[PDB]
Amino acid sequence: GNRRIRSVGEMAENQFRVGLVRVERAVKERLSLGDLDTLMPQDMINAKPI
DNA sequence: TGCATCCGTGAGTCGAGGGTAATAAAAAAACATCATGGGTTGAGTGTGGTTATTGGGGCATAATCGATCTGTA
């Protein structure tokens, strides 16, 4: 009753959360220092960490 | 003296894949350096050339058979 079964979906979602934390670490500065009008969301995100 | 605190320890052969990745700026000048290309050394490998021959065949100069008409009891 005190032990829990963690299956593949759970660790997959945990790793995805880590990837999104990595993304936010750069988006926090990208929004603060970047352009306000011509900035498209595509060019300011990075798919390598996830 | 009692307290927390830190520091080593803890098997053995074996196999199969075996490597993955958060990010970043451009100019200019200045200099170093290798890369190729063309030209002297030079270093070969290449190729004919005269002169030492030693078996072989040869012509001389000798030699040992093979066949028939004149001399002796």
Swiss-Prot record:
PTM per Swiss-Prot/TrEMBL: Acetylated on several lysine residues in the presence of glucose.
Highest taxon of the lineage: Bacteria
Biotechnology: Co-administration of salinamide and rifampicin or salinamide and myxopyronin suppresses the emergence of resistance to both antibiotics.
The family this protein is said to belong to: Belongs to the RNA polymerase beta chain family.
Subunit structure: The RNAP catalytic core consists of 2 alpha, 1 beta, 1 beta' and 1 omega subunit. When a sigma factor is associated with the core the holoenzyme is formed, which can initiate transcription. The rRNA transcription and antitermination complex (rrnTAC) consists of RNAP, NusA, NusB, NusE (rpsJ), NusG, SubB, ribosomal protein S4, DNA and precursor rRNA; S4 is more flexible than other subunits. In pull-down experiments interacts with CedA. (Microbial infection) Interacts (via flap domain) with Escherichia phage lambda antitermination protein Q; this interaction renders bacterial RNAP resistant to transcription pausing and allows it to read through termination signals.
Function: DNA-dependent RNA polymerase (RNAP) catalyzes the transcription of DNA into RNA using the four ribonucleoside triphosphates as substrates.
Protein name as catalogued: DNA-directed RNA polymerase subunit beta
